[PDB]
Amino acid sequence: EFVTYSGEESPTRTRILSAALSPAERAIFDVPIEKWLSIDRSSLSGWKCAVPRPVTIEQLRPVDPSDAILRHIALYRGPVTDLQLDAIVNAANTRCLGGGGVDGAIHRVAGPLLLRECATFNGCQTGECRLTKGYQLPARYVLHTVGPVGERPDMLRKCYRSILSLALKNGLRSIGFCCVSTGVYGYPLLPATRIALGETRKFLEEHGGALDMCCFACFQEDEYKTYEKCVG
């Protein structure tokens, strides 16, 4: 029933999947993906939230409560993993089996089952998004997206469209974003930020009533200040 990939359809994956799980971990892994949104995760003996004081939707402040669109956009100074929203975004690579930066961080907080779930599919194409459970994150789901290497605006735009499409299709009402393609993938920060906000605005204009909050988590001050300058 859930759509888990925006696109069209390994010794490393084999070995990830053959690693032992406890019975309690199996119970978590076994929850069907669509049930994870609403399940009482504390009913699973193997589960815990790895973020001591998650940031909830109520705690965020939108950019402009009076604006039709900007009342649904917030900026957050901190890591995306803090956010207790329906989904957070992971900036992945095409192998989609973890890495450095935010990808590494998300995997560390979520715990080992996130990698295990990523090993059940064959990576992620550039511009597309894979949906997984979020395990020990306060957020319910992770939207793993693969940005372009280099300044390819139509593929960075596609990433945002893919993320937002999956949220719409699956009834997810709040999304925490990280910077996609900036830094190691070399997408210049200001142009990337213009695209992130532009695509999110366009989506909110077209699908008003489907999303309650798009929060841009800015782990670095330069990211935060760039988002701030682009929203006024």
Numbering used by the authors: 13 to 21, 39 to 261
Paper text:
We named these proteins as Trypanosoma brucei MacroD-like protein (TbMDO) and Trypanosoma cruzi MacroD-like protein (TcMDO). We show that the trypanosomatid MacroD1/MacroD2 homologues are hydrolyzing both protein-linked ADP-ribose and free O-acetyl-ADP-ribose. The macrodomain fold (starting from residues 99 and 92 in TbMDO and TcMDO, respectively) is well-conserved between the human MacroD proteins and consists of a central mostly parallel six-stranded β-sheet surrounded by five α-helices. Active site of the macrodomains is located at the C-terminal edge of the β-sheet and is lined by N-terminal ends of four α-helices.
Crystal structures of TbMDO were determined to 1.95 Å and 1.2 Å resolution (for crystal form 1 and 2, respectively) and crystal structure of TcMDO to 2.0 Å resolution. The two crystal forms of TbMDO are almost identical with RMSD of 0.4 Å. Structures of TbMDO and TcMDO comprise residues from 11–261 and 13–257, respectively and share a highly conserved structure (RMSD 0.84 Å). While the N-terminus of the TbMDO folds back to the core and extends the β-sheet, the N-terminus of the TcMDO packs to the precisely same site but in the neighboring molecule in the crystal. When comparing the ADP-ribose bound structure to apo-TbMDO, it is evident that the binding site for ADP-ribose in TbMDO is preformed. Upon binding of ADP-ribose, eight water molecules (and a glycerol molecule) are displaced but no large conformational changes in coordinating residues are observed.
